[PDB]
Amino acid sequence: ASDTAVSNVVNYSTDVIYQIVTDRFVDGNTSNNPTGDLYDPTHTSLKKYFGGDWQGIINKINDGYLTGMGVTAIWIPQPVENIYAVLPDSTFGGSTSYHGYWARDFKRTNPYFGSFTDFQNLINTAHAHNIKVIIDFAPNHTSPASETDPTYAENGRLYDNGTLLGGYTNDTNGYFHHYGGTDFSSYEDGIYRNLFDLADLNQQNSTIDSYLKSAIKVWLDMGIDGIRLDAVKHMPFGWQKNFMDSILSYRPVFTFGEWFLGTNEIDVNNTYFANESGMSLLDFRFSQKVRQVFRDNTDTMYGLDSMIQSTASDYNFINDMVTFIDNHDMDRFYNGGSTRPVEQALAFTLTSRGVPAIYYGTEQYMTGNGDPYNRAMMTSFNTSTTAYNVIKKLAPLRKSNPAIAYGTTQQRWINNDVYIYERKFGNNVALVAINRNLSTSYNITGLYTALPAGTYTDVLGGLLNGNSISVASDGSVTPFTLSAGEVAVWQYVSSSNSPLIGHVGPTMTKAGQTITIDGRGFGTTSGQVLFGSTAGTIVSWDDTEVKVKVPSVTPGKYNISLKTSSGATSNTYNNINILTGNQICVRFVVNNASTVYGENVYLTGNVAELGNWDTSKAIGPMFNQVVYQYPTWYYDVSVPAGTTIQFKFIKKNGNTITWEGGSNHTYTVPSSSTGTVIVNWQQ
Ligand SMILES: [Ca+2]
Ligand SMILES: [Ca+2]
Numbered sequence: 001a002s003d004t005a006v007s008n009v010v011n012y013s014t015d016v017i018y019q020i021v022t023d024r025f026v027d028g029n030t031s032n033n034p035t036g037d038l039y040d041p042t043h044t045s046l047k048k049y050f051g052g053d054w055q056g057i058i059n060k061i062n063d064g065y066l067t068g069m070g071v072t073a074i075w076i077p078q079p080v081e082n083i084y085a086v087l088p089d090s091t092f093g094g095s096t097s098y099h100g101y102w103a104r105d106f107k108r109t110n111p112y113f114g115s116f117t118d119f120q121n122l123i124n125t126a127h128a129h130n131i132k133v134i135i136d137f138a139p140n141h142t143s144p145a146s147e148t149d150p151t152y153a154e155n156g157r158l159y160d161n162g163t164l165l166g167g168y169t170n171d172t173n174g175y176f177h178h179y180g181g182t183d184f185s186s187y188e189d190g191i192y193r194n195l196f197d198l199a200d201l202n203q204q205n206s207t208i209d210s211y212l213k214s215a216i217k218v219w220l221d222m223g224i225d226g227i228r229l230d231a232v233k234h235m236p237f238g239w240q241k242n243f244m245d246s247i248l249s250y251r252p253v254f255t256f257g258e259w260f261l262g263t264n265e266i267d268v269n270n271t272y273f274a275n276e277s278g279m280s281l282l283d284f285r286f287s288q289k290v291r292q293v294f295r296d297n298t299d300t301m302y303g304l305d306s307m308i309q310s311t312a313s314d315y316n317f318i319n320d321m322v323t324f325i326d327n328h329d330m331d332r333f334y335n336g337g338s339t340r341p342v343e344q345a346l347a348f349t350l351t352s353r354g355v356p357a358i359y360y361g362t363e364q365y366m367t368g369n370g371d372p373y374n375r376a377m378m379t380s381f382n383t384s385t386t387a388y389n390v391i392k393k394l395a396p397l398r399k400s401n402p403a404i405a406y407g408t409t410q411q412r413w414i415n416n417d418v419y420i421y422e423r424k425f426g427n428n429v430a431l432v433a434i435n436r437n438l439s440t441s442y443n444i445t446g447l448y449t450a451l452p453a454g455t456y457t458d459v460l461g462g463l464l465n466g467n468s469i470s471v472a473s474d475g476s477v478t479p480f481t482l483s484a485g486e487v488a489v490w491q492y493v494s495s496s497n498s499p500l501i502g503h504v505g506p507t508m509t510k511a512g513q514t515i516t517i518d519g520r521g522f523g524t525t526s527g528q529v530l531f532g533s534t535a536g537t538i539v540s541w542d543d544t545e546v547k548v549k550v551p552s553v554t555p556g557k558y559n560i561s562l563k564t565s566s567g568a569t570s571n572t573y574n575n576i577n578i579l580t581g582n583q584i585c586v587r588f589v590v591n592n593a594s595t596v597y598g599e600n601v602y603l604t605g606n607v608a609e610l611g612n613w614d615t616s617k618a619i620g621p622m623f624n625q626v627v628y629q630y631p632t633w634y635y636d637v638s639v640p641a642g643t644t645i646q647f648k649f650i651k652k653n654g655n656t657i658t659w660e661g662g663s664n665h666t667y668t669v670p671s672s673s674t675g676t677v678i679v680n681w682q683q
Helices: 054-062 116-128 187-192 206-221 237-250 268-276 284-295 301-314 340-351 386-394 402-406
Strands: 017-019 073-076 080-082 087-089 093-095 103-109 132-137 141-144 158-160 163-166 198-200 226-229 254-257 355-359 408-414 418-425 428-435 442-444 454-456 469-471 480-482 487-492 500-505 514-520 528-531 537-541 545-549 556-563 573-578 583-591 600-605 633-640 644-652 665-668 675-680
Touching: 054 073, 054 116, 073 226, 103 116, 103 141, 103 206, 116 132, 132 206, 206 237, 237 254, 237 268, 237 583, 237 633, 284 301, 284 340, 301 408, 301 418, 340 355, 340 386, 340 428, 340 487, 402 418, 402 428, 402 500, 402 514, 418 442, 454 487, 500 556, 500 573, 514 556, 583 600, 600 633, 633 644, 665 675
Parallel strands: 017 073, 017 355, 073 132, 103 158, 132 226, 226 254, 583 675
Antiparallel strands: 080 103, 087 093, 141 198, 158 163, 408 418, 418 428, 428 487, 442 480, 454 469, 500 514, 514 545, 528 556, 537 545, 556 573, 583 633, 600 644, 644 665
């Protein structure tokens, strides 16, 4: 199977995701609809169940609507059993779990969406049509709760395949956090306190850790192809790395988290998370900039290029960034007036780096500013809209042109309103020109490209007013006019390729596991895959995909390269993280660690998971507000099971790092359960 096959579920760079709000798409089976106050058959009371279900999605796969658009993946809300209570809402009358965000049993289905058999039907129907299926999973919380009023909602009660674990009131087991609600005043505050009134799960509780691992395996066993993890800024990094290892050790699938970033927001924790957690991220830097430039007129094409360059610098796995122009929370991109801006934002996203996702109804110009106005029932299945056809024409290019799926991005021409950029992967090229100005044309002179000499037709066929270009042997493009609102796409796909790696997944692995290397020019005869300079055992070999067993190298990060059977060597794909063993979440706690202003406590130790004594990569800054208070510090850390570790704490700020004196602390990590290790700072 090639890199582009539906069964390659660790690489989504060749795909286009269609994000469906299940309840609000198609009611394919009325018999599974809720009854009473939960359900609104009129589809107008925007926090009720409207009846959209998995059979409905199946219908639109079978009838060609989604495939006719070039959709190759769907992303659906959490499939798990949700609460049945109808909650008061002064604006919408009643408020329900239609959205899937309010889990009561992570091991069972939401019966309104369907049974496990319906879910199976969805997976199988999608696969029969070369569509991958991503599910939301929201292990941060169960549902709205009041500890003092257990009659409110379902008191956040959690079940384990029908068996009650417990609720938020009288939580004698400590399944939930009891630290009030977050005001988002710090990263720490947002992790250990409740989001709104949602009962915050305590993942450090060994029963809950084991439960959530068991629960995601239920869905992996149902044949899901990907996971979108909700609220990843609101759970410990260490717990989530541990959670990711459980998934990837069982059956690896592409996983991406939601870590919201606002306009112009800078957060090094977001970069770290994407680079270290073992999962990818929804690309808010991309999305917010696209909105600024194409929708809201608060930045220019210069800002768009700056985002392209900055994100590529910061993120180790730029091809895994999940891009989008709107979603279930943002104001819908189409806001009235000309539809050209949304068409342009779609074209940009579909031809840019990463993994594009399109929110249902974007192709029908649906409007709606704010949750839940942005979640109206799907309005139309008209296949003649300009937006539908932009997607139809551009989506398949991610499969047919490896420059689009995997290539670098280079600015070739720019002014405030015009961006001409080039995607390049070996001798494969895509050149895209966009003029956002809806009233002014631009004369394009001095343009150069890596496209071979020749004349190139617009892949869009003039749908967005594109036209042909002529390219000379020196790469110079004959002057041309970019008309108002024009988008044009020109491409060259080479008939041959030197070995080129476009993607490796998963990025967090260990000895004996299998990783997938995708690209071009590997040849059909088996060669060699190198982890640094150490060969791995070949599982399978094809021109666009090699599967290889991870060798027993010293745990840490490795740069992957490939050598063909003739001896040709590929580029390196960097920073594949080889763990020491299966992961466990351990809470590290240090008492009596006093610091000066601007100084924080960090953890360092003698395994890769603790940075192998590298103070510049020490774990932290540690926390000291919620679970324990300064000068006690704590942090939840993913560490190798059953391993006897040595560690110390350090204090750093910018002047001179202070280490604990004395001998190293030592601790043997549990074999399967979460653990806590508490020590006193050593002078
Ligand atoms: Ca239904
Ligand atoms: Ca939390």
